Ligand binder design. Structure first.
Ligand code: A1IKR
Ligand code: ZN
Length: 257
């Protein structure tokens, strides 16, 4: 019964998921002045040309665009990573207002939304194994700011009407995730966690410095989704973000400057 309400939101999660108060939780604030440039990170490799999207699902907390991860088709390598990480799904976190919605912050600034492209380390065989390991997942995080429309997001926005409520899904084949990336792949990286229960400390975070721009109309459509199931009182799917957690004994590294 976790969620984003007053009764069941982030401040309550520790009761069912004690790791909520752990040593490597996410998201965090990225203090740009304290992040250190690391000239050794190796180049970052996003290989999405053969991606095979399958379906879009409203899971009651966000919507997920799911991919075929039974073979190396859409993979993340390089940067801080050792080995090959397969794309399994992406989703977003967003606000009720344009000045909130991101999970990570940058010098305390919140963006309107944040995209998470979730990948798992192929050495562990399946995603359920990978989330048990400290280097199991690599999440590419991309900030969204409100301005000009993002063309590559529009196919997602257009299908949302068909998955308004929890448990609805729709076919979502032939979607190209390359259309959601910014120009630059400059990034920050740090070890962290899933930002929703079970909050497992299995993620190498790769947060891009450059946000993408989406239109007010695009993000308004996100906010028409429902957390509730069909035939239940309407609760708009907004403010599905976890706030920044303590950095503790971690360093955030920059790929640039
Ligand atoms: O850290 B997020 O990318 O927000 C969470 C991803 C996540 C994926 C599968 C199961 C539970 C959570
Ligand atoms: Zn997420």
């Amino acid at each position: 019964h976790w969620g984003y309400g007053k009764h069941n939101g982030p401040e309550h999660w520790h009761k069912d998921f004690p790791i909520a108060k752990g040593e490597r939780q996410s998201p965090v604030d990225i203090d740009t002045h304290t992040a250190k440039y690391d000239p050794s990170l190796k180049p970052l490799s996003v290989s999405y040309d053969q991606a095979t999207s399958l379906r879009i699902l409203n899971n009651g907390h966000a919507f997920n665009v799911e991919f075929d991860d039974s073979q190396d088709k859409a993979v993340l390598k390089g940067g801080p990573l050792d080995g090959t990480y397969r794309l399994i799904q992406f989703h977003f976190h967003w606000g009720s207002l344009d000045g909130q919605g991101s999970e990570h912050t940058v010098d305390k600034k919140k963006y309107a939304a944040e995209l998470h492209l979730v990948h798992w380390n192929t050495k562990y065989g399946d995603f359920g194994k990978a989330v048990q390991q400290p280097d199991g997942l690599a999440v590419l995080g991309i900030f969204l700011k409100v301005g000009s429309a993002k063309p590559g997001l529009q196919k997602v926005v257009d299908v949302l009407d068909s998955i308004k409520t929890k448990g609805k899904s729709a076919d979502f084949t032939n979607f190209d995730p390359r259309g959601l990336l910014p120009e630059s792949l400059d990034y920050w990286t740090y070890p962290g966690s899933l930002t929703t229960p079970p909050l497992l400390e299995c993620v190498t975070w790769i947060v891009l410095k450059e946000p993408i721009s989406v239109s007010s109309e695009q993000v308004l459509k996100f906010r028409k989704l429902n957390f509730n199931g069909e035939g239940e009182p309407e609760e708009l799917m907004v403010d599905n973000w976890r706030p920044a957690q303590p950095l503790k004994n971690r360093q955030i590294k920059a790929s640039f400057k």
